[PDB]
Design brief:
The structure is cut from a larger assembly and holds 1 copy of chain A (266 residues), 2 copies of chain B (52 residues), 1 copy of chain C (67 residues) and 10 copies of chain D.
Chain A (H helix, E strand, L loop, with lengths): L4 H7 L5 E3 L17 E3 L1 H21 L9 H20 L7 H17 L7 H8 L14 H34 L8 H40 L6 H34 L1
Antiparallel strand pairs in A: 1-2
Helix pairs in contact in A: 2-4, 3-4, 4-8, 6-7, 6-8, 7-8
Chain C lengths: L1 E6 L4 E14 L3 E4 L10 E10 L3 E7 L5
Antiparallel strand pairs in C: 1-2, 2-3, 2-4, 4-5
Chain D lengths: L1 H38 L4 H15 L1 H17 L1
Helix pairs in contact in D: 1-2, 1-3
The chains are: A mainly alpha (266), B mainly alpha (52), C mainly beta (67), D mainly alpha (77).
Protein name (chain A): ATP synthase subunit a
GO molecular function (chain A): hydrolase activity; proton-transporting ATP synthase activity, rotational mechanism
Keywords (chain A): ATP synthesis, Cell membrane, CF(0), Hydrogen ion transport, Hydrolase, Ion transport, Membrane, Transmembrane, Transmembrane helix, Transport
């Protein structure tokens, strides 16, 4: 098994896709050209959590009593408290959509990041040596496509709220007048506001992507370079630090989503 | 990196999980907590109404 | 114009409406025009200039105090 | 690999600049948070909430800078 | 090089990673849940005894 | 050809500089928001409102530069 | 050849500098605006009016430079 | 040949440094202007009178630089 | 020959900027830590906890810069 | 041709750096002039006629670098 | 040959940057420490105690930038 | 003829830095002087004295650099 | 040339960056020392002693480059 | 000889950085000196003493670079 450090660290970049056109698993050595090649490792594994989310919340929501709650119910109410105490501070419009939307984003993004705290090679090890197939990486958040998909979705919601809540007549007045509120500036104002709009989803997604990709790649490094008995001294502190980041990314994403949506709807 | 149609695929699962939680989970727990709050608020309120 | 008071532990010393005043604040000379933002400072012993409305400049001697 | 050696300078410029920017921005913001806390310790949790609320904006570009610099360093190069 | 050594280093790292959590992370997280449980026992009982 | 060797550097700079700019700008702008909050809490909703109003105008040129940098690094290169 | 790429290097330097300038300038300006508001929120609209009046002056030169970036990248090309 | 592009680098240097200078300077100056205005809100007209006067001094050298950069790019 | 120079030049710039960013950010922050300490000294250890919790997020990116820097010196020579 | 072009770049570094010096230097100095102004609207003439003096010191060296930069670009060419 | 003799530029960059990072960083940090003393002269040695703690974090990166520069000085070149 | 044209780049990288240093130093110092005067109008002359006496030390090493720059650009050129 | 003389260049870089570092790192702390003195006219000696302590703590790491540039010029070149 | 221009450049660099550093540091320190003087005018000679004292450290490093620059510009070049 001639894995060199420079090579082992290169293999880790590779997803296990399947050609949409030809139902072919795309082999790592040659990457086919097309837009029709699903990343299977970050998609099924992403909805793994999409399901383990509902199935871990639905299994209380029906059961609860407003009396003294159990410990699991105590944690669930603590998380609903965090979320709702956040949302109530900044969105005054009572539109139902924003309230459970933040819950999904927070919990789901936290779960996506959480996978990365397990050692890197182990899931690929099992998934290749038993199931044979040529590739595996296990952090949905470290695939740009998921992040920019969520960004595009919230971007749709932004524009919808802008329409519904102040219409095209307000939307156009804003995009034309701001910031200077006079005709002589407008042809420049028109570019600025669209740029700002596009930046919101762009930044929202790319912040998370970069954070998690860079956090993963450190573990990718040390597990192949240092003398294997020593790797703990620089794998451990990094994870110790990393937990704070995976949580903060979910928090930031949730709160900025709330903020921008409120900013459009109010 | 080279973008992929998965950016289109993932959005569907996202919106589906939103559609589900939105109705199957949230109002349920909203009631499950609001009821617990109201039952205490009303207890102390009625007790003040008694003392007055 | 704004409404100025100069008072002491014992007796009042001025009351009425003013345009500006100039005061040798503890940290530096200072001048108050209407609408001045909230402020709180000690002042050094010395004169202060009142210009009562219609512009009737006046001088008062203060042995210290707080503004 | 003259072409390749410029890439490992490009990643260096990108992420060095991102490092300075993010580090100093967070330093300033956290400094103001710290003096605010020292004024009102029993506000500390709310001010931490707000510190994390805004700090997410200081990273908006510098992470994108890592997002592309490291990508080039390991997918383009 | 050798593959099997990497799993060994990863295990040595992972156990030392978890050990600190279960003595410095989870105890506070569960302490907050105990705080909430105590609170809600307080909030309900202290209104039932006002019904009394 | 030689084009591959310069563009991945030009974009690198074009975006690292915007990183520095936006990072320092937002750090400074948020510092005063935190000090004001710690000074007079419960005005936090109003401070946050007009903070976000202003902050939107700080991102303009940095984000334009980021966009054009990417438009070069891939669509041109 | 170089008569293409060095144009992009010039565009990068020009827009990077313009971005740092506009961002940090408006960050300082907005910071002082914020604390001014915090000390008395009832003036806010007047301060905002003067804030815009000045933030216009800030941008005059950066917005020249940014546009010249495009004149380079799409007319000299 | 080198005569064409390098000149525009010589332009962008001046152009960008002028943007830096003007932006940061007007920033500082307007920051103090806004704090002074929030102090004495009713004297805004006089403060603005003096503000524009002092400001006119700041853009001088940056405006020289940009005037020359325009030549370097367009005229040559 | 020329190939193996730019790796060390890249590490040089990358880690010098990492050092600048870290030192300046955390000096700024520690200045406010010491301000608060000298203003509410019985409060020190709490504010030191908060200082470390800020410092973590400050040092998040510079240390990745250090890692990616030494990568170029010892993982790719 | 060879002996001409770099002179354009020599003038640039001078007239560029000279701008930043004079703009910020007059920027800071102008600020404190306004800081004093609001404390004492009555001394606004006396300070004005004081601003102009030291304002002459700051802009001394920059105006050297402007003239000499012009010398190279038009008198040396 | 060019490489080893040029690598000495790398250390000059790498450690020259760290020099100012550490120098300005603690320059700020010490500046606050002195004022805590000038306000609480009956509190200095406590403030000095904590000063030493944080003062380590400031240069912690400059340490390796310097040491790695010395590795280039002698070991690499 | 390179050793001729390059000396103007040398003169630039002397004069521009000298100019920036002088302008920044004198702007800072004159700002402190100006606000001092704005507070203590009677002490204008007494402070003016000290301002000149102190500025005399700032102007010392910019004048060295500008002298050497004039030497290079004319006395040898 | 490139074997012998570029060693002078890198040492000039070392002893220029460290020249920035010493000047600013000391100026900041010295200004805080002076303002503390003006606040506490009785404590000049105490404060100056603490200042020299932290002064040496500052200048330690620049002085590395201070010696190193000379060694390069006169022992390596 | 095609590498005397490199020695002109190295000297110009080291001296320009020394000029920036020394000017700015002395400016800061003198600014605080004038503030203190404006507060306690009957202390100006006592603080002016210390201003002369600490000021030396603000230039003790830069003057090294200045002397080396003169040396190379005339003794070597």
């Amino acid at each position: 098994e001639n894995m060199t450090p420079q090579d082992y660290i290169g293999h880790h970049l590779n997803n296990l896709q399947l050609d949409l056109r030809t139902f072919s698993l795309v082999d790592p050595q040659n990457p086919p050209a097309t837009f029709w090649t699903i990343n299977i490792d970050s998609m099924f594994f992403s909805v793994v959590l999409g399901l383990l989310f509902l199935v871990l919340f639905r299994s209380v929501a029906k059961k609860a009593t407003s009396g003294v709650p159990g410990k699991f119910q105590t944690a669930i109410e603590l998380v609903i408290g965090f979320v709702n105490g956040s949302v109530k501070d900044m969105y005054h419009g009572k539109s139902k959509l924003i309230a459970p939307l933040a819950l999904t984003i927070f919990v789901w993004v936290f779960l996506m990041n959480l996978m990365d705290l397990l050692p890197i090679d182990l899931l690929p090890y099992i998934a290749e040596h038993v199931l044979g197939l040529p590739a595996l990486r296990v952090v949905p958040s470290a695939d740009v496509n998921v992040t920019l998909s969520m960004a595009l979705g919230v971007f749709i919601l932004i524009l919808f709220y802008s329409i519904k809540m102040k219409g095209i007549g307000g939307f156009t007045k804003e995009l034309t007048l701001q910031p200077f509120n006079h005709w002589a500036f407008i042809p420049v104002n028109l570019i600025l506001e669209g740029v700002s709009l596009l930046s919101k989803p762009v930044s929202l997604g790319l912040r998370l992507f970069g954070n998690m990709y860079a956090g993963e790649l450190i573990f990718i490094l040390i597990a192949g370079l240092l003398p294997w008995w020593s790797q703990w001294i620089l794998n451990v502190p990094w994870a110790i630090f990393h937990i704070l980041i995976i949580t903060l990314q979910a928090f930031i994403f949730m709160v900025l989503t709330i903020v921008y949506l409120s900013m459009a709807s109010e | 990196m080279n973008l992929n149609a998965t950016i289109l695929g993932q959005a569907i699962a996202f919106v589906l999980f939103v559609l589900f939680c939105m109705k199957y989970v949230w109002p349920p727990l909203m009631a499950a907590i609001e009821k617990r709050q109201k039952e205490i608020a009303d207890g102390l309120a009625s007790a003040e109404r008694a003392h007055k | 114009t704004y409404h100025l008071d100069v008072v002491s532990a014992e007796q009042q010393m001025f009351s009425g409406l003013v345009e500006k005043i100039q005061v040798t604040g503890s940290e530096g000379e200072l001048g108050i025009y209407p609408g001045h933002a909230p402020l709180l400072t000690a002042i050094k012993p010395g004169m202060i200039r009142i210009v009562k409305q219609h512009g009737h400049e006046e001088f008062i001697y203060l042995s210290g105090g707080i503004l | 690999n003259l072409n390749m050696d410029l890439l490992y300078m490009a990643a260096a410029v990108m992420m060095g600049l991102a490092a300075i920017g993010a580090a100093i921005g967070i330093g300033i913001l956290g400094g103001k948070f710290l003096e605010g806390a020292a004024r009102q310790p029993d506000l500390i949790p709310l001010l931490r909430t707000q510190f994390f609320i805004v700090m997410g904006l200081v990273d908006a570009i510098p992470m994108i800078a890592v997002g592309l610099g490291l990508y080039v360093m390991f997918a383009v190069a």
